[PDB]
Ligand binder design. Structure first.
Ligand SMILES: [Zn+2]
Ligand SMILES: [Zn+2]
Length: 404
């Protein structure tokens, strides 16, 4: 029998800095290498100290979001890592653009110097490195997102990275022995898409109707363009809103460039990034509008601990200006999901289709992940013909499996 070891260095019982180590029959693989959106500098990095970069044969990146590849430039240009790295074409493209803008660990120089060290891979195409065969499936979630299936000595493991089944994620016909899957939404169930878009539109409407400024923080394109389509349509069907502008930083939406390139007048809707409001325009606008109860913000994506958007949802009496000033939070705050992750029914169905004897949960808040684990254990705790062990390792903790 051969022993297989899986160990999160990031995203273990948390969302952020996804980086999971896999060790089997002499090979070592790293799955993702991102940073924690809610942490600063070196503290926002996975615990790559526990390992020797030089011993990593393969590095696979699921998608372009920062919590999955935010720390790559650093890893590639500042450690003893001399292995091979792979991404899908689109992922790599958006990588340079996205990580660059992130540069407001490494520098613009390092990023451009890592591009050469990153190989691309097409979907449904088998690649081989050090006796490790791998290929990817569409993950849904975002453009270019991939779920890597890995095979070593006949043992197969599927890593979902981040995925959605609502472009929908493919369900592999090839059954893996091990499944590493995201736990973002835990046991939550997503509300009907139509009810979601209606509540989103009615909330935006309420804000501008009372003379308010409505802020909609969004990232690169995790749903940005989709929301613009929803609002524009709604505006078309409501002539009484034609004089209320909608800016994006279509027939009713105009593009904005900066807080210095737009007039902040009467009621309006402004969709700006970053989605989690740590800095940038979304944060500046929030700081300029938070004291007026007529205004409102609508968080349309999942927000990691440590971020302003997440804190705002706790409905604090006051907020902290980037400059350190204290401002009262009077604008309304609403949360309507559009982050594109699977909910419990979708995760459950995915796992039921593949029936992996071993399921390893990552990328989920501790408590959310614990309920998912329990609910999954409960699902197969009844039938004795399907044995599935669910693991929820903390960062640094290893899961050990023996094969053959
Ligand atoms: Zn993601
Ligand atoms: Zn993620």
């Amino acid at each position: 029998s051969d022993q297989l070891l899986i160990r999160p260095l990031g995203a273990g019982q948390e969302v952020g800095r996804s980086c999971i180590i896999l060790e089997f029959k002499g090979r070592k693989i790293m799955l993702d290498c991102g940073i924690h959106p809610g942490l600063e500098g070196m503290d926002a990095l996975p615990y790559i100290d526990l390992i020797d970069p030089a011993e990593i044969d393969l590095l696979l990146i699921s998608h372009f979001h920062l919590d999955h590849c935010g720390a790559l430039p650093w890893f590639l240009q500042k450690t003893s890592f001399k292995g091979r790295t792979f991404m899908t074409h689109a992922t790599k493209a958006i990588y340079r653009w996205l990580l660059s803008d992130y540069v407001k660990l490494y520098t613009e120089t390092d990023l451009e110097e890592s591009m050469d060290k990153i190989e691309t891979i097409n979907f449904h195409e088998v690649k081989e490195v050090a006796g490790i065969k791998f290929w990817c499936y569409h993950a849904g979630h975002v453009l270019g997102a991939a779920m890597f299936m890995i095979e070593i000595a006949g043992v197969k493991l599927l890593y979902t990275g981040d995925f959605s089944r609502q472009m929908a994620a493919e369900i592999p016909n090839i059954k893996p022995d091990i499944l590493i899957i995201e736990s973002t939404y835990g046991t939550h169930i997503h509300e009907k898409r139509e009810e979601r878009e209606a509540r989103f539109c009615n909330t935006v409407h309420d804000i501008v109707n009372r003379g308010g400024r409505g802020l909609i923080p969004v990232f690169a394109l995790g749903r940005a363009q989709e929301l613009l389509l929803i609002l524009d349509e709604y505006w078309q069907n409501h002539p009484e809103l034609h004089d209320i502008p909608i800016y994006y930083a279509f027939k009713h939406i105009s593009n904005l460039k900066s807080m210095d390139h737009f007039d902040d007048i009467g009621p309006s809707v402004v969709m700006a990034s970053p989605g989690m409001m740590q800095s940038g325009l979304s944060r500046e606008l929030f700081e300029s509008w938070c004291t007026d109860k007529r205004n409102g913000v609508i968080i349309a994506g999942y927000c990691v601990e440590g971020t302003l958007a997440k804190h705002i949802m706790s409905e604090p009496e006051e907020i902290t200006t980037m400059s350190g000033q204290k401002l009262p939070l009077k604008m309304s705050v609403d949360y309507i999901s559009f982050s594109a992750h699977t909910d419990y029914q979708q995760t459950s169905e995915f796992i039921r289709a593949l029936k992996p004897p071993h399921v390893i949960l990552v990328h989920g808040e501790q408590n959310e992940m614990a309920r998912l684990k329990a609910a999954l254990i409960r699902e197969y705790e009844d039938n004795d013909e399907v044995h599935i062990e669910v693991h929820n390792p903390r960062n640094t903790e290893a899961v050990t499996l023996n094969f053959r």
